[PDB]
Amino acid sequence: ILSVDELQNYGINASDLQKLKSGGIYTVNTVLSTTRRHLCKIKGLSEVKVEKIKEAAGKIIQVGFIPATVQLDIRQRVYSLSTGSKQLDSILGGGIMTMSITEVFGEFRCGKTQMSHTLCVTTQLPREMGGGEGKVAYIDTEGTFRPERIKQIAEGYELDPESCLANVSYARALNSEHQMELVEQLGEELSSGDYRLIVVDSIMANFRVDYCGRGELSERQQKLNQHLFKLNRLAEEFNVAVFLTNQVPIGGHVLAHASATRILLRKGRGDERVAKLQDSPDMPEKECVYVIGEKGITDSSD
Amino acid sequence: ILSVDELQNYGINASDLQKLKSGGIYTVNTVLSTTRRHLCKIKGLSEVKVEKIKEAAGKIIQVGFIPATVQLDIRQRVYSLSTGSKQLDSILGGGIMTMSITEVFGEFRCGKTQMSHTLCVTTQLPREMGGGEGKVAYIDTEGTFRPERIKQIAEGYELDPESCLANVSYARALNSEHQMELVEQLGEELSSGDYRLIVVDSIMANFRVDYCGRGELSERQQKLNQHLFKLNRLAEEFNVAVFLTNQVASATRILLRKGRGDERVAKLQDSPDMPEKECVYVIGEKGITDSSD
Amino acid sequence: ILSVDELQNYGINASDLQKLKSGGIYTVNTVLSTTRRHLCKIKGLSEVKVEKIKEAAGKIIQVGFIPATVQLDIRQRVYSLSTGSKQLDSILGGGIMTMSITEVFGEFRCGKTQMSHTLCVTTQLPREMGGGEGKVAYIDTEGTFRPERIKQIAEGYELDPESCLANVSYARALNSEHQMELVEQLGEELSSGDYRLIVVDSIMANFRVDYLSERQQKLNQHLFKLNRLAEEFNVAVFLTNQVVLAHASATRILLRKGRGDERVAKLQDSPDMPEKECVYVIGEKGITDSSD
Amino acid sequence: ILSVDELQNYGINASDLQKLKSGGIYTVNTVLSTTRRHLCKIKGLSEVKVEKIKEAAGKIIQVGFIPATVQLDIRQRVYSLSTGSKQLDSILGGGIMTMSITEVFGEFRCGKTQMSHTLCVTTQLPREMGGGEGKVAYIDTEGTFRPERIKQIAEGYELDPESCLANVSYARALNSEHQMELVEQLGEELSSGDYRLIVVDSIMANFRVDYCGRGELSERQKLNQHLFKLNRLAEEFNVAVFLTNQVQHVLAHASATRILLRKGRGDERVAKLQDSPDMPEKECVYVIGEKGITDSSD
Amino acid sequence: ILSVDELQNYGINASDLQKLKSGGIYTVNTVLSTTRRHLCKIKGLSEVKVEKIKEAAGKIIQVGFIPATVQLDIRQRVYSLSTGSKQLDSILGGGIMTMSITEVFGEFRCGKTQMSHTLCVTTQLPREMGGGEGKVAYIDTEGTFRPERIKQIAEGYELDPESCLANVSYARALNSEHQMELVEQLGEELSSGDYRLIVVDSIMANFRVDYCGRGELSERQKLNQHLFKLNRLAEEFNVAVFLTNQVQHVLAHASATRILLRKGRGDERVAKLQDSPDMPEKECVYVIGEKGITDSSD
Amino acid sequence: ILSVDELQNYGINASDLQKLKSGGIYTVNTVLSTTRRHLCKIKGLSEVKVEKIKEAAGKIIQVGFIPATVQLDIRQRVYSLSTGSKQLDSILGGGIMTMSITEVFGEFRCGKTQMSHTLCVTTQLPREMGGGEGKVAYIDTEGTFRPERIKQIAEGYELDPESCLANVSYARALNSEHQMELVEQLGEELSSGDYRLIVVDSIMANFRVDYELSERQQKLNQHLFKLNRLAEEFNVAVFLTNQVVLAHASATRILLRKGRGDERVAKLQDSPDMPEKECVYVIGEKGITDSSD
Ligand SMILES: Nc1ncnc2c1ncn2[C@@H]1O[C@H](COP(=O)(O)OP(=O)(O)O)[C@@H](O)[C@H]1O
Ligand SMILES: Nc1ncnc2c1ncn2[C@@H]1O[C@H](COP(=O)(O)OP(=O)(O)O)[C@@H](O)[C@H]1O
Ligand SMILES: Nc1ncnc2c1ncn2[C@@H]1O[C@H](COP(=O)(O)OP(=O)(O)O)[C@@H](O)[C@H]1O
Ligand SMILES: [Mg+2]
Ligand SMILES: [Mg+2]
Ligand SMILES: [Mg+2]
């Protein structure tokens, strides 16, 4: 990831960089992504500075027409974060992928928060065993974050548990607007390049709580759009997997279109649970079997 | 617990604070957890002043990304409210957890009211003795409260019956609605911060009789739901444990069944910390205990 | 127990009092225990009107978290009415308990009616010897009520017979609907607050004849109304039953025929006391101990 | 006893009264007793009509809580029908009491039919000597109703025998359903208020024959309905119900009081009060003489 | 395709040619297409210079009235790019046709991106079997372009995956302004004449987010200019512009031919030729197999 | 039709014919129609030459008030170009009229291009069948011309298709200025006199993107004036199509609309002489045909 600071040599004053920081512009990728119209309304930014900023930013990263071979090289750098269950890793083609949006959904009691915790613990695993070796941002919209569970699963994975606990980040989304403010503020944390996973558990809870009654659902939806859009944008810029959790599916066409990958969970026999991929741009629908044990989400044979 | 007093020296007028008091906001955590649109809905509050109130609340304590190590340090303050049964304490990690909602259901004469009384007495116990050394609030819907039982249990644990009987604030939840605003007006009581337990027994007794007939169950549900929602949030910022009793949203769920003779069986259904287990208990002179006890 | 008339002092027109009394609301306690939704169902009352009447009633008597010492004090006024036998009263903690539903059941002629008469006479006794010093409302469904038995037992306890008879308010329930309307009208007569006991003998002798799901729902409504009335009016509602209803009754006792006139009373269920059994007998003095 | 015709002046036309009488309702007490649902089953009656009928009946005779002194005054209207033997009258507290069911049972020849004849002849006696001074409805399920015995006992009680015979309403029940049809047509002739006793001798003779096999024992809830109807008329007409039964849980709970009849030494007979709502168990000695049941010493 | 570099020897210096390159004019056909008023807007270009450039370009290729046999010969140079399913090719009369705008639209998951990848590979096919034997210009507006998918489909089409990927030129459009800047800069790369297809998947993705509120619908004429530029590129460069649209008027006018995609039972998919310049409305069955869009039978 | 070559015997040298031909004048009719001033603006033609040419050419045709005695004979020289639909020709009086500009307009997919293609073939037919037995000039501004469609329609009419394409001269109008150049030097091709139709499809396509309105209509009216005179002295029909000041130039106007289902409506919006009427047409393999046919 390349931030906005390293622009000092290209002819950008510190005042303009600070204005970009205040506007939520923390990296070159979001400099390119943000249009000149949206760049203009940034506080303190003129209608002539945004252009020269744009040509300055265009020089660092080659933004143009390229053969698909270098595009394959680009997509080689996304990480297939393991979801704990090896069969669930295989069915998704490696598991949750960074730079893309993946949603898990189902009834209550189906094992979603446990999937989130398993991702939080395995995301700090290095390459070649399903980890990304990158930090995690957890948004707790349900107040259900249990750090001792993360330490437990870390002991299960034979890693220094205190390190795993310090690496994972955490926020308690007290309301939908607090969650929105948090996802908007992720700029200066994701800019450092240490974070390679955002997990929201759940995504819709505060939206359903704050917005009640049919007279504001559309409002919710469009806010959701922005929220979801930002998440997707945050996925594409900093190369982080966005892992949503939702109850039931619900979210409508808005969430169906926003979510690139979708998984449904349902109960099986005892602690055995069964999952169904429902939508994905790479793989067809199939089935998988998992269990919730002392080390989070694993295979039944584990 | 950080009440709304610390807004005054941060740039908030006394009239604004009193309006917040009328608005149901009595702690810094509560105002930090209230939506701007929700905060301006309070009568006498304009949308311009709620913003400055919000950052005034935000300066005293930060809300956002905090390393999970610090979140674990914060979680370390929670106290396990001992049920009185050492084995049942073990199967729940020391008892009822704070910051969360506990629900108990089963057939009648299964000890749920006895469980409520035992928690109501053990809450006064100091730390490392299964209690938070804090006060109790009892919200009675079935009218089965017996202060004589609290005195008896305080005798059983070698506690002053008058002292434990004194640290219990009691109120009858006559109807479902009255239950709603009796839960709503807990801000004043918990703003002292001494409280560690709130008990409602039973949760569904008032709602089941206030809304009868399949013509309104749906709306009845959401009523109950919003009630539950408040309870859930009412459990978090105040570091209290809410014990809900049910008759046959809740973070913990327990089933109680009648066993052979005078013993009963306890089973766990839902928990965000430990898997389900099984246990046995009796109702001795000190309340719910182990059979050998 | 305070009538809603003090509510008149709070800027409230007499039409409100008449409407509340017509709707079955006869005391500030009933106002506090009645919901806005059901109070609006009363003809002539609007939503804001019900809101203001409720807040005025709450201004009369506060309903909120009080220290439990005050709850013990208000619990001290709870009356323990002797059943006539010292053993059963001891295993009951001092007799029957007000603010609660006591149900006794057993075989045919286990002494349920005789023990109902003993409860009818003992409640008129003052405190310090297991009484309640007040009147008793006797709802009879099988036709087994006998004033002469009450007179004889009252003479046994060495008190005026005719005053004892005039001290009991009796009603015969002909069928289930009459049984319900009687307990509905109990509020008006109990608003005076003199009564202490509500005997129903027996609860479902008319429900069985008049009818299942509708019968069960109607009986559930009946028992709920009885329980609410017992809670609000500081009276013990004592039920008898023959051989669902356990849900409403706070305390349950089973009666078994023994050898000859000897009878066994078993505490099958209680909210407070443990499972204990005892022996009693029906004699010239009513319900007495086996040695007595 | 106030008939339903007393509702005519309260705002009810004769058509509704006739429709009520068609359903077996001849007394305002029966109007109050019958639930609104059962009154809806009456042909030609609507829910509004049922409600207004009930409201009108409530006003003429009040139902509500009253002081128990008034209830003692009401219970003072209960007759004590003489059994014929003074000691058994003392044991029973005055004899056979109306408003309740009295059952007598025992072996054959104990004198159950003779007891029924004695009651049918002594009910006609005035008060203050054990009589109810009213008519008696005899139902014979055995063919043993002997008017000559009634005449003989009436002559024994120095009373006109012809009036005694004319004063008793005799019916012969051929089978069980005929016996029922009799008991729920009894409402018409009981409305006159002249009857104080309903003798059913016996209650089991027709049922033990008309129903045979374990399949029909469950059906004989029909007997429950029969006995409930008898108790209802006993309550709402102030008449004693004197049932007769033989020996070889229904009647145990249906009958308010019970008596065993047993054979003694020689012609002596013993009557044991097995159950009674208010009296304790005792035993009496009696004989069956020319005047029916009589004290053994006399 | 003859680049404007053919004007250097006709009496135009290199500076004017370089300015033409900077002005977006890269072909003599592009010179003839555009009006002199548009050339005079270019910095450093005067009216006389513009006129002499137009005069010189007119001599290279004639623009006048010719017999329709010659125009039939010219129309014989269109490319019939197979869609992937032979049935839909028969419905289209040869599949995709160049010098035209083909717009396929449908709901999410319908298979517009899969068909775009099938097109990226099948255009590279030599002709006589449904191909175009040329490069592809892929513009992605949603991040859904999978090079591995093209690799796998090309392997299904027994081709070298590495060269097949090297031919297609990919561009990720972050926002609408970038998407446009890309489409006008497409003129420089298209001047080689190697390309046969320009995929835009999807056309309206950046517009739904870069413009919000009823105020900016009027500005979202800029999209019309975008589509006009795409149409001009397709007309001048003998390339087929294949658009993708998401469903929930002027856009319909811009596209020469349209296809609508619908989901059927199971994985069966249906394609309807909603609008076509010279074909009737029909229905086709297709599936997304290991080699992209293909017939349901195979 | 007689070209300016026959003027040479009047006393005019061949040294001035080429420059006047470069000025857009190729026939004596164009000489008479044009004014002295417009000949003066032509480079190389002096005022003496301007007056000499016109005075020499004017001794073949007179100018004055005209009773209709002889014009009816000249009026019957007008051809009736069949549209392909008997009903549509009937409401149009037998088909598209020459000596005038016919304009059809409609929204997207109304069949205007198909109508132009059909009219390219029906002209090939002789008279007494709705044709003109002559060439067709197609000016295309949207790129929707298809010689294979002409093939199909000519096959439909039982005609030689290769000859039919041989008799259709095509020209693609890239922009408005090239469109006007095509129109202005179209006279040199029509000087042969064998043409019977001129198709411009569509007339407004180039101007809507090239153009500021004042100059747009200023140029458009000149374009329409030139088209109208071409149609006038060349005995050809100018067929224009429009997508939905033009109405004044076009003598006949037709609206094509999509009706219920696949039915299409051809309303006669405006005609110089015949009343507004109604028709239904279908685009078949033969081009434009009647709904029943
Ligand atoms: N510390 C633990 N060790 C083992 N299992 C646990 C632990 N904590 C929770 N679980 C199990 O994880 C299961 C699913 O939890 P969770 O993911 O929170 O469900 P949800 O899908 O509702 O979020 C629970 O049934 C519980 O038994
Ligand atoms: N990598 C793949 N390999 C095979 N089939 C695929 C692949 N990706 C998607 N599909 C199929 O195509 C469908 C989605 O096609 P896509 O072009 O992404 O739809 P759209 O563009 O209309 O949203 C999937 O449901 C699946 O059937
Ligand atoms: N060869 C053909 N045979 C029959 N109908 C056709 C043929 N070609 C096109 N069409 C019909 O003609 C219509 C196209 O009309 P078009 O000429 O494009 O009008 P416009 O130019 O006003 O858009 C299409 O809807 C199509 O159904
Ligand atoms: Mg969860
Ligand atoms: Mg797509
Ligand atoms: Mg067209």
PDB file of all heavy atoms in Angstrom, chain E residues 112-113 142 144 201 246, ligand 5:
ATOM      1  N   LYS E 112     -23.325 -12.117 -17.644  1.00  0.00           N
ATOM      2  CA  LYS E 112     -22.792 -11.103 -18.544  1.00  0.00           C
ATOM      3  C   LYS E 112     -21.269 -11.060 -18.497  1.00  0.00           C
ATOM      4  O   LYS E 112     -20.617 -10.889 -19.534  1.00  0.00           O
ATOM      5  CB  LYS E 112     -23.393  -9.741 -18.206  1.00  0.00           C
ATOM      6  CG  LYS E 112     -24.902  -9.774 -18.054  1.00  0.00           C
ATOM      7  CD  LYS E 112     -25.466  -8.424 -17.659  1.00  0.00           C
ATOM      8  CE  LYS E 112     -25.119  -8.063 -16.232  1.00  0.00           C
ATOM      9  NZ  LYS E 112     -25.868  -8.900 -15.261  1.00  0.00           N
ATOM     10  N   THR E 113     -20.680 -11.225 -17.311  1.00  0.00           N
ATOM     11  CA  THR E 113     -19.222 -11.252 -17.214  1.00  0.00           C
ATOM     12  C   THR E 113     -18.651 -12.542 -17.793  1.00  0.00           C
ATOM     13  O   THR E 113     -17.596 -12.529 -18.441  1.00  0.00           O
ATOM     14  CB  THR E 113     -18.793 -11.082 -15.761  1.00  0.00           C
ATOM     15  OG1 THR E 113     -19.402  -9.902 -15.221  1.00  0.00           O
ATOM     16  CG2 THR E 113     -17.290 -10.950 -15.670  1.00  0.00           C
ATOM     17  N   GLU E 142     -16.331  -3.045 -12.213  1.00  0.00           N
ATOM     18  CA  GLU E 142     -16.758  -3.653 -10.961  1.00  0.00           C
ATOM     19  C   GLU E 142     -15.723  -4.579 -10.340  1.00  0.00           C
ATOM     20  O   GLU E 142     -15.999  -5.149  -9.280  1.00  0.00           O
ATOM     21  CB  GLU E 142     -18.067  -4.425 -11.170  1.00  0.00           C
ATOM     22  CG  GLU E 142     -19.304  -3.551 -11.160  1.00  0.00           C
ATOM     23  CD  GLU E 142     -20.535  -4.284 -11.653  1.00  0.00           C
ATOM     24  OE1 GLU E 142     -20.410  -5.467 -12.032  1.00  0.00           O
ATOM     25  OE2 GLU E 142     -21.626  -3.678 -11.662  1.00  0.00           O
ATOM     26  N   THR E 144     -14.699  -7.452 -11.590  1.00  0.00           N
ATOM     27  CA  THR E 144     -15.117  -8.825 -11.834  1.00  0.00           C
ATOM     28  C   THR E 144     -14.309  -9.520 -12.921  1.00  0.00           C
ATOM     29  O   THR E 144     -14.621 -10.664 -13.265  1.00  0.00           O
ATOM     30  CB  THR E 144     -16.600  -8.861 -12.208  1.00  0.00           C
ATOM     31  OG1 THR E 144     -16.820  -8.026 -13.349  1.00  0.00           O
ATOM     32  CG2 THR E 144     -17.450  -8.361 -11.057  1.00  0.00           C
ATOM     33  N   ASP E 201     -17.767  -3.699 -19.158  1.00  0.00           N
ATOM     34  CA  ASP E 201     -18.490  -4.468 -18.147  1.00  0.00           C
ATOM     35  C   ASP E 201     -18.214  -3.855 -16.778  1.00  0.00           C
ATOM     36  O   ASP E 201     -17.135  -4.057 -16.214  1.00  0.00           O
ATOM     37  CB  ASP E 201     -18.067  -5.931 -18.184  1.00  0.00           C
ATOM     38  CG  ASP E 201     -18.891  -6.801 -17.262  1.00  0.00           C
ATOM     39  OD1 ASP E 201     -18.755  -6.666 -16.029  1.00  0.00           O
ATOM     40  OD2 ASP E 201     -19.677  -7.624 -17.766  1.00  0.00           O
ATOM     41  N   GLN E 246     -26.771  -3.674 -16.037  1.00  0.00           N
ATOM     42  CA  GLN E 246     -27.495  -4.276 -14.926  1.00  0.00           C
ATOM     43  C   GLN E 246     -28.905  -3.707 -14.855  1.00  0.00           C
ATOM     44  O   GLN E 246     -29.104  -2.495 -14.968  1.00  0.00           O
ATOM     45  CB  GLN E 246     -26.773  -4.024 -13.602  1.00  0.00           C
ATOM     46  CG  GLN E 246     -25.459  -4.762 -13.452  1.00  0.00           C
ATOM     47  CD  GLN E 246     -25.605  -6.041 -12.655  1.00  0.00           C
ATOM     48  OE1 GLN E 246     -26.703  -6.579 -12.520  1.00  0.00           O
ATOM     49  NE2 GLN E 246     -24.496  -6.535 -12.121  1.00  0.00           N
TER      50      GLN E 246
HETATM   51 MG    MG G   5     -21.005  -8.942 -13.902  1.00  0.00          MG
END
